[PDB]
Amino acid sequence: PKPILYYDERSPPVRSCLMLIKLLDIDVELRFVNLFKGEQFQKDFLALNPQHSVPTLVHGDLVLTDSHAILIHLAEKFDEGGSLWPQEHAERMKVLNLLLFECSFLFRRDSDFMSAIVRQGFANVDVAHHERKLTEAYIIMERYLENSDFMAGPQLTLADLSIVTTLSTVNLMFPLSQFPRLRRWFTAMQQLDAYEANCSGLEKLRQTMESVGSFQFPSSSAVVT
């Protein structure tokens, strides 16, 4: 049976899976779970994923509840022997290490910021606090890109797919003017045909966040090429 992806394209980790699905031309059934309406708490989805989170993948008997596991699973089954999830051990561990950076550091801090907007309203958020936290993530990614051309090495990997969706979401708010390597990398990612799968959900996220938070992202921040 072909994979089933429970999704809300506003979510960066969902969009990372959408990019991989487009990149590898995987046939996947899409099942929308509207996070704005709380559909992740629907009884059947909750029993499927007690974390009530998207993306969730059902592929046969396998149920994955984290984008980073979904990316690895889909790469092993549809990019077998390929370079997105590289064959050599050290290269693969480097990709895994950056996937975990996305979970542990980048997405955690972006989610922290957007959760404060939803709960308090943008005018009541300590924006300077979150600017510091997320600029710190910019600094770290700039350092990674000072030593390699893509995030995890000389070529595109799963790490770039995971990170670029959250980047583009952070960059709705915070400009990349002071980060030339990260701007060059982001521009290169935007030229990829697979990046088309990030565009619609990023814009839907912008619309929803501006509505719920009663604010506007500064239009000048987002890198657009």
Ligand X SMILES: N[C@@H](CCC(=O)N[C@@H](CS[C@H]1C(=O)c2sccc2N(Cc2ccc(F)cc2)S1(=O)=O)C(=O)NCC(=O)O)C(=O)O
Instruction: Candidates 31, 36, 87, 104: give the one binding its own copies (CB under 8 A).
Output: 104
Task: Check: CB of residue 6 under 8 Å from CB of residue 31.
Answer: yes
Residues 31-70 that bind ligand X (CB under 6 A): 35-36, 40, 52-55, 66-68
Count other Cβ atoms within 10 Å, centred on residue 52. 17
Any idea which residue has 């995030």 for tokens?
151
How far is residue 89 CA from its own chain's centroid? 24
Report the alpha-carbon distance of residue 4 to residue 57 in Å, rounded. Answer: 6
Instruction: Candidates 76, 131, 149, 196: give the one binding its own copies (CB under 8 A).
Output: 76
72 lies in the site for its own copies, by CB under 8 A: yes
Report the alpha-carbon distance of residue 224 to residue 190 in Å, rounded. Answer: 8
- Give the binding range for ligand X (CB under 6 A) out of 7-15, 19-27, 121-129, 190-198: 7-15
Q: Could you tell me how many residues of this chain bind ligand X (CB under 6 A)?
A: 26
In angstroms, what is the minimal distance from the CB of 61 to its own copies?
A: 7
Q: How far is CA 135 from CA 38, 74, 132, 142, in A?
A: 31, 31, 5, 10
- When CB distances are held under 5 to 8 angstroms depending on the partner's kind, the choice from its own copies, ligand X, none that residue 27 binds is none
Contact footprint for ligand X (CB under 6 A): 8, 10-13, 35-36, 40, 52-55, 66-68, 100, 103-104, 111, 114-115, 118, 205, 208-209, 212
